[PDB]
A paper describes a structure:
The bacterial CYP105 family is involved in secondary metabolite biosynthetic pathways and plays essential roles in the biotransformation of xenobiotics. This study investigates the newly identified H2O2-mediated CYP105D18 from Streptomyces laurentii as the first bacterial CYP for N-oxidation. The CYP105 family is involved in biosynthetic pathways of secondary metabolites and biotransformation of xenobiotic compounds.
Crystallization experiments for full-length CYP105D18 yielded crystals in the space group C2 diffracting to 1.7 Å. A Ramachandran plot analysis of the refined model showed that 96.55 and 0% of non-glycine residues were in favored regions and outliers, respectively. The final model of CYP105D18 exhibited electron density for most of the molecule, except for the N-terminus (amino acids 1–3) and a loop containing residues 73–85, which connected αB and αC [dotted line in Fig. 5(a)]. The asymmetric unit had one molecule of CYP105D18. A flexible, less structured loop was observed in the B/C loop, and electron density for residues 73–84 was absent from the substrate-free structure, indicating that this region had a high degree of flexibility. Taken to­gether, these findings show that the B/C loop in the active site of the CYP105D18 structure was flexible and remained in an open confirmation without substrate. Across from the heme molecule are Phe338 and Gln348, which correspond to Phe441 and Gln451 of P450 4B1 and show a closed conformation. Notably, the substrate-free CYP105D18 shows a small blob on the heme molecules, as depicted in Fig. 6, indicating that the heme of CYP105D18 is oxidized. Structural comparisons between the substrate-free and complex forms of CYP105D18s revealed that conformation changes occurred mainly in the B/C loop region.
Residue numbers in the entry: 4 to 72, 85 to 396
Amino acid sequence: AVAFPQNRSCPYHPPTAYEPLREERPLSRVTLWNGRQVWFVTGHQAARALLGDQRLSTDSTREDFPLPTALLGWDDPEHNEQRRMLIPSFTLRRAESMRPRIQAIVDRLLDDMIAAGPSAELVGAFALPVPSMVICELLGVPYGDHEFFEEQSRRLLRGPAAEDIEKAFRSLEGYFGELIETKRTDPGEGVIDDLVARQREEGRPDDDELVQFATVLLVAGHETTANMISLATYTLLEHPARLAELRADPGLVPAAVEELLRFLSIADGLVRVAREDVPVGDQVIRAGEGVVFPTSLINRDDSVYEHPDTLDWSRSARHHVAFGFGIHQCLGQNLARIELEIALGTLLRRLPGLRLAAPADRIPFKPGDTIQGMLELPVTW
Ligand code: HEM
């Protein structure tokens, strides 16, 4: 009987206690804090089929939803209508168009970090601000508000008190309300403009719903990307031969981003409840049963990935579930991939001497029940 969720022992490996469940495919079981048993999807093929099944729910308002302690929560057709409105802002072409803006953001934060001193706390100096500044550009927040937006987005993650997190949420919701007005009578480019055009053309996203979309995109897009920058950098520094390959051939960085997404799987333990019976081979997930998708184990299914517990830039990470799959699959994945390519590739290019400025086991990382990644990352160069 294995308790879920558990803390990682090593920032870049799945929790040690899950290792015996990896052989039990496609479905195993884990126990939540209150003794409730839930299904634990260990099979890659099964995880992909299940994450496409409308009989699983993300609606945390259901009495039967598993407590391990808007888009998400929404079942279709509401959910489908929300996604339809946002998908066009998140195409591959729209991500590729953002490259020069992302490069400028990354370059400015590295210039400032290098100027300030010979060492840095990389999470606060780089990993945290890159994605909130990209989301700033994505939403079309005007230049003069960039500092305000970065400051409030940081407060929403770093707090420290629950009061700071709440005041930041209210400040951003209030700001998004004002900006929708500003952009109606002074249209620019970005997701808010895209959704203002949709509202005039279709009446579809009302102002309250547009504000919720902006808040969701920031929350979905900020910490995940920041933790991938921080944990990827720590993982690379702890694998000198793998890091050396990327320094030698910058052309490897896009494939390395996929392999790091697979190997790190920071959005770990996706949760669903079955609304109706769902069969998986000769097993049946009954209506009301919890279903947990341990991203990190699914991405290490050795039926799909040879030597799955090793970092390998040459062994295909294609079809990984780091961005989820099916109904709720990450809307930002095209944008996230380019942010990571530019952030990690530019860091590696500019700072070839980059190294940890503390022993690896004194560097704090997130506990098991949240998005995985580094809290701090002291580096020198
Ligand atoms: C490396 C960075 C990221 C990772 C690892 C990641 C991972 C994920 C995962 C696993 C989900 C599905 C959750 C589930 O099925 O329960 C998801 C959903 C989502 N992501 Fe991402 N994400 C990243 C970056 C972004 C960015 C940059 C944005 C927006 C700018 C974004 C917006 C979203 C949205 C809006 C959803 C919900 C889609 C829906 O519910 O229909 N994410 N993300």
